[PDB]
Amino acid sequence: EEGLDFPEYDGVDRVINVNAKNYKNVFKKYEVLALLYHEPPEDDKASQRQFEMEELILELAAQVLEDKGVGFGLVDSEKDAAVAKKLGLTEEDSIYVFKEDEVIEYDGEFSADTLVEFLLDVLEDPVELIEGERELQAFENIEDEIKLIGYFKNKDSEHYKAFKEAAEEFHPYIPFFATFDSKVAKKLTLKLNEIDFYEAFMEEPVTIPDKPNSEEEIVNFVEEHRRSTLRKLKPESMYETWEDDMDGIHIVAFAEEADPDGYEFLEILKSVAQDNTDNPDLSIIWIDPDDFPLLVPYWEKTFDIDLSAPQIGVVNVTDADSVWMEMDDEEDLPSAEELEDWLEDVLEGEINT
Ligand SMILES: [Ca+2]
Ligand SMILES: [Ca+2]
Ligand SMILES: [Ca+2]
Ligand SMILES: [Ca+2]
Ligand SMILES: [Ca+2]
Ligand SMILES: [Ca+2]
Ligand code: NA
Ligand code: NA
User: Fold this and answer.
1) Which of 82, 107, 167, 279 pairs as cysteine with 240 (C-beta 3.0–4.6 A)?
2) Sign of the CA dihedral with 286 first, then 291, 292, and 293 last
3) Which residues make up the environment of ion ligand 5, defined by Cβ < 5 Å?
């Protein structure tokens, strides 16, 4: 009796060298396939070590997800240029995820935790059905992401099928929910074939106009409303969010949700968002420092702030130059009006509008 060990990385290689000769068979073997499209090995040790680490991160994810039929592979942009073309791999050192007839160009954190969570989400069906109270309550409780909900006759409705096709386009980043139950639709205030879009952190939805909606109408609407006034930086999508800057800058708020002050600040931020939701020139990024433990020292040093307290600032995406609002913690946090006033002062002395 020694006592069984927790699972451990076993050092067995599972990541596939995907090439011209095997790529068709690889796609046949796995229902979900994650492929790292990468540049060939440079001569310097630094580059080789960076690649070595990325590959092992994939190995860890591959071990974890082996039983679930998720495969992992490498496509060398030189040795495997032809495979890349056929598959549409363009972005250097980027992960592409394949499920059925969909390709996803992953733009999140390169970590085993984040990748595994993402791929488990990918494996799920694209539409969540609401039948019970638990499920409806779960839907109502979602705030930190855009969500859509539609009421349809049944799974065979042409309009449900269009909704599902649209859901697949954004899977798994934007949750699509459906109900076939008139009582549920009643509580959600949905007419038949009506689809309500809830912007992140917004209480009131916007109904997609011109129902019943084609797949294209839904996709167009979501794309047009893709950027919420307040959005959360999430590991699974951090790079896409950060690269979607507001003319060279982001307004960035740090708030630890689990902390009393961080929670209060978040409620204030939500008020600011709600009061300015119609302004297309405004996006605030909420970062919870608890979600990014490896970046906290860097942020505290770079921005010269204490992340144990709520913060709000404006960051220049070009050089990481920034300015942060002074808040005395011996008094109440600034009100929504005060935050808006400060943002106006900072941004009025700028290059636009
Ligand atoms: Ca390869
Ligand atoms: Ca995820
Ligand atoms: Ca309604
Ligand atoms: Ca229509
Ligand atoms: Ca808005
Ligand atoms: Ca993280
Ligand atoms: Na998701
Ligand atoms: Na938190």
Assistant:
1) 107
2) positive
3) 229, 277
